[PDB]
Design an enzyme around this catalytic site. Structure first.
Site, PDB file in Angstrom:
ATOM      1  N   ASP A   1      41.230  47.758  33.065  1.00  0.00           N
ATOM      2  CA  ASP A   1      40.655  48.750  33.987  1.00  0.00           C
ATOM      3  C   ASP A   1      39.350  49.241  33.383  1.00  0.00           C
ATOM      4  OD1 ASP A   1      40.847  50.094  36.469  1.00  0.00           O
ATOM      5  OD2 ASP A   1      41.530  51.889  35.419  1.00  0.00           O
ATOM      6  N   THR A   2      38.243  48.906  34.017  1.00  0.00           N
ATOM      7  CA  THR A   2      36.917  49.501  33.711  1.00  0.00           C
ATOM      8  C   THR A   2      36.741  50.799  34.491  1.00  0.00           C
ATOM      9  OG1 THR A   2      35.857  48.011  35.353  1.00  0.00           O
ATOM     10  CG2 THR A   2      35.857  47.326  33.044  1.00  0.00           C
TER      11      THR A   2
ATOM     12  N   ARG B   1      41.657  39.989  46.721  1.00  0.00           N
ATOM     13  CA  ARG B   1      40.904  39.614  45.494  1.00  0.00           C
ATOM     14  C   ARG B   1      41.735  38.609  44.695  1.00  0.00           C
ATOM     15  NH1 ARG B   1      39.703  45.590  43.082  1.00  0.00           N
ATOM     16  NH2 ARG B   1      41.976  45.437  42.986  1.00  0.00           N
TER      17      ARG B   1
ATOM     18  N   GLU C   1      34.877  53.183  37.091  1.00  0.00           N
ATOM     19  CA  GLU C   1      34.053  52.918  38.296  1.00  0.00           C
ATOM     20  C   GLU C   1      32.605  53.187  37.905  1.00  0.00           C
ATOM     21  OE1 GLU C   1      35.414  51.552  40.979  1.00  0.00           O
ATOM     22  OE2 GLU C   1      37.386  51.677  39.988  1.00  0.00           O
TER      23      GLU C   1
ATOM     24  N   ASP D   1      35.059  45.148  36.218  1.00  0.00           N
ATOM     25  CA  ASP D   1      36.286  44.315  36.276  1.00  0.00           C
ATOM     26  C   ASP D   1      36.382  43.539  37.593  1.00  0.00           C
ATOM     27  OD1 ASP D   1      37.031  46.282  38.090  1.00  0.00           O
ATOM     28  OD2 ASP D   1      38.428  47.240  36.709  1.00  0.00           O
TER      29      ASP D   1
ATOM     30  N   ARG E   1      39.341  40.066  40.677  1.00  0.00           N
ATOM     31  CA  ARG E   1      39.740  41.248  39.886  1.00  0.00           C
ATOM     32  C   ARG E   1      40.331  40.755  38.562  1.00  0.00           C
ATOM     33  NH1 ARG E   1      41.017  45.071  37.056  1.00  0.00           N
ATOM     34  NH2 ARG E   1      41.503  47.186  37.739  1.00  0.00           N
TER      35      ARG E   1
HETATM   36  C1  LIG Z   1      44.550  44.506  38.280  1.00  0.00           C
HETATM   37  C2  LIG Z   1      45.390  44.580  39.532  1.00  0.00           C
HETATM   38  C3  LIG Z   1      45.142  45.511  40.528  1.00  0.00           C
HETATM   39  N1  LIG Z   1      45.915  45.529  41.624  1.00  0.00           N
HETATM   40  C4  LIG Z   1      45.726  46.517  42.676  1.00  0.00           C
HETATM   41  C5  LIG Z   1      46.570  47.726  42.256  1.00  0.00           C
HETATM   42  C6  LIG Z   1      45.729  48.915  42.609  1.00  0.00           C
HETATM   43  O1  LIG Z   1      46.176  49.447  43.877  1.00  0.00           O
HETATM   44  P1  LIG Z   1      45.485  50.746  44.581  1.00  0.00           P
HETATM   45  O2  LIG Z   1      44.220  50.294  45.249  1.00  0.00           O
HETATM   46  O3  LIG Z   1      46.570  51.050  45.558  1.00  0.00           O
HETATM   47  O4  LIG Z   1      45.227  51.796  43.574  1.00  0.00           O
HETATM   48  C7  LIG Z   1      44.298  48.372  42.643  1.00  0.00           C
HETATM   49  C8  LIG Z   1      43.466  48.706  41.407  1.00  0.00           C
HETATM   50  O5  LIG Z   1      42.224  48.007  41.468  1.00  0.00           O
HETATM   51  P2  LIG Z   1      40.889  48.718  41.017  1.00  0.00           P
HETATM   52  O6  LIG Z   1      41.050  49.242  39.584  1.00  0.00           O
HETATM   53  O7  LIG Z   1      39.830  47.635  41.135  1.00  0.00           O
HETATM   54  O8  LIG Z   1      40.693  49.811  42.010  1.00  0.00           O
HETATM   55  O9  LIG Z   1      44.383  46.984  42.726  1.00  0.00           O
HETATM   56  C9  LIG Z   1      47.013  44.653  41.750  1.00  0.00           C
HETATM   57  O10 LIG Z   1      47.708  44.724  42.782  1.00  0.00           O
HETATM   58  N2  LIG Z   1      47.278  43.731  40.828  1.00  0.00           N
HETATM   59  C10 LIG Z   1      46.551  43.662  39.711  1.00  0.00           C
HETATM   60  O11 LIG Z   1      46.818  42.820  38.861  1.00  0.00           O
HETATM   61 CA   LIG Z   2      38.328  49.746  37.977  1.00  0.00          CA
END
Ligand SMILES: Cc1cn([C@H]2C[C@H](OP(=O)(O)O)[C@@H](COP(=O)(O)O)O2)c(=O)[nH]c1=O
Ligand SMILES: [Ca+2]
Length: 129
Positions: free
Chosen positions: A34-35, A75, A37, A15, A29
Site C-alpha cells: 500500500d503506497t 485491476r 495516495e 502501487d 494493482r
Molecule cells: C491489493 C489489493 C487490493 N484490493 C482491493 C481491496 C480494497 O478495497 P476498497 O476499495 O473496498 O477499499 C482496494 C484497495 O486498493 P487501493 O489501495 O488501490 O485503493 O482494492 C483487492 O481486492 N485485492 C488486492 O490484492
Molecule cells: Ca494505495
C-alpha cells in the site's frame, strides 16, 4: 510462480500502473503493498519512485500469484518486475509502501516483503522516519 512479458503504457501512482498484457491495455494493482495516495504524505515520492522504476526499465514482467488475478475494480493483481527487480519489494524496502492487503492464496512473496519492511523500519526510511 512465473514471469510473463508486458510493456509500460503509463505510470499511474505508487502501487498502480497501466501495462499492455497479452496485447490488451490493463491497470495493474501491485500485490501485498500500500503506497500513500498522491495527495497524502510520501504519495508523490511513491508515485515518482514507481514511475522512474517502470519508465527506465528495458523489460517489464508481470507475475501472477496463485489466486485472484483481477480485483473487484477489474485491476490486474500481480508482482511487477523492472529488469528483474520487483517494484513491490523495492517500494517496501525504501519505506514508500507498507505490506498490506495480504489475502490467503495470493501471498507467495509475503515474507520476502515483510523482511524488506523490517529493514526499512530499522533504517527509519520515509514512512518510518
Ligand atoms: C491489493 C489489493 C487490493 N484490493 C482491493 C481491496 C480494497 O478495497 P476498497 O476499495 O473496498 O477499499 C482496494 C484497495 O486498493 P487501493 O489501495 O488501490 O485503493 O482494492 C483487492 O481486492 N485485492 C488486492 O490484492
Ligand atoms: Ca494505495
Amino acid at each position: 510462480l512465473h514471469k510473463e512479458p508486458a510493456t509500460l503504457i503509463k505510470a499511474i501512482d505508487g502501487d498502480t500502473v497501466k501495462l499492455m498484457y497479452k496485447g490488451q491495455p490493463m491497470t495493474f494493482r501491485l500485490l501485498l503493498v500500500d503506497t500513500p495516495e498522491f495527495n497524502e504524505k510520501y504519495g508523490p515520492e511513491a508515485s515518482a519512485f514507481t514511475k522512474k522504476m517502470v519508465e527506465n526499465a528495458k523489460k517489464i514482467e508481470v507475475e501472477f500469484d496463485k489466486g485472484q488475478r483481477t480485483d473487484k475494480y477489474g485491476r490486474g493483481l500481480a508482482y511487477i518486475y523492472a529488469d528483474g527487480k520487483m517494484v513491490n519489494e523495492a517500494l517496501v524496502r525504501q519505506g514508500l509502501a507498507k505490506v498490506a492487503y495480504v489475502y490467503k492464496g495470493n501471498n507467495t512473496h509475503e515474507q520476502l516483503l515483510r523482511k524488506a519492511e523490517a529493514q526499512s523500519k530499522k533504517e527509519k526510511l520515509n514512512i518510518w522516519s
